[PDB]
Amino acid sequence: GAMAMPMIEYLERFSLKAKINNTTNLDYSRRFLEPFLRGINVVYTPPQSFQSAPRVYRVNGLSRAPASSETFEHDGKKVTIASYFHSRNYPLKFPQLHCLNVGSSIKSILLPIELCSIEEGQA
Numbered sequence: 001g002a003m004a005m006p007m008i009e010y011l012e013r014f015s016l017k018a019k020i021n022n023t024t025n026l027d028y029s030r031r032f033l034e035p036f037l038r039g040i041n042v043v044y045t046p047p048q049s050f051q052s053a054p055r056v057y058r059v060n061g062l063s064r065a066p067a068s069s070e071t072f073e074h075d076g077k078k079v080t081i082a083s084y085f086h087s088r089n090y091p092l093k094f095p096q097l098h099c100l101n102v103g104s105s106i107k108s109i110l111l112p113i114e115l116c117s118i119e120e121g122q123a
Contacts, residue, residue, distance in 0.1 A: 004043050004117035011113075022094070026113075030062060030098040037062050041122035042100060045115050049088040056122060059100045063110045068095035070110060081110055 012019050015029050038061040046052035063070060067081040079087070082095035092112060099110035 002043075002117075002119065003121050004119045007042065007113045007116040007118045010118050020094070026094070026097050027066070030113075031064075034061050037100065040118060042102070042111065042116040042118050043122075044111055045117060047085070047088055047090050047115070049090060054117065056119070057100075057102045057111065059102045059111070061101045062098050063101050064098075066096045066098050067092055067110065067112060070099075081112075085112070 008020050011026075011029065011033075015033060016024070018024075020026070037059050040059045041056050042059055043054045043056050045054045067085075068083075070081045071078050072081070072084070073079075074084075080095075081099060082092045085092055093114060097113055099112050100116065101108065102111050103109035
């Protein structure tokens with residue numbers, strides 16, 4: 001039994017003391033959660049479309065803009081973080097989520113907090 005808590009479930013219990021919903025703007029907590037997210041370890045569960053398995057990442061913090069509000073350009077075509085996952089046949093339940101700023105100085109990547117299992121001991 002791994003001590004891996006779903007990061008949304010984590011915020012429900014500890015952060016908002018209420019259950020995350022469509023109408024809840026994560027920003028109103030997530031923006032202040034930076035000092036906590038800055039230096040955590042998440043077991044990220046990648047969509048099977050990527051053919052990857054759960055992997056722990058040291059989260060450096062959080063993006064100032066949610067998944068749908070962040071845009072990257074693949075070969076001239078501009079798509080949002082959410083659009084990319086949607087392209088993987090994975091329409092984000094909450095595109096208004098502030099993804100994890102993980103990776104490294106070079107790899108500035110944003111990981112959807114919904115698909116993250118935070119191990120309470122690793123964090």
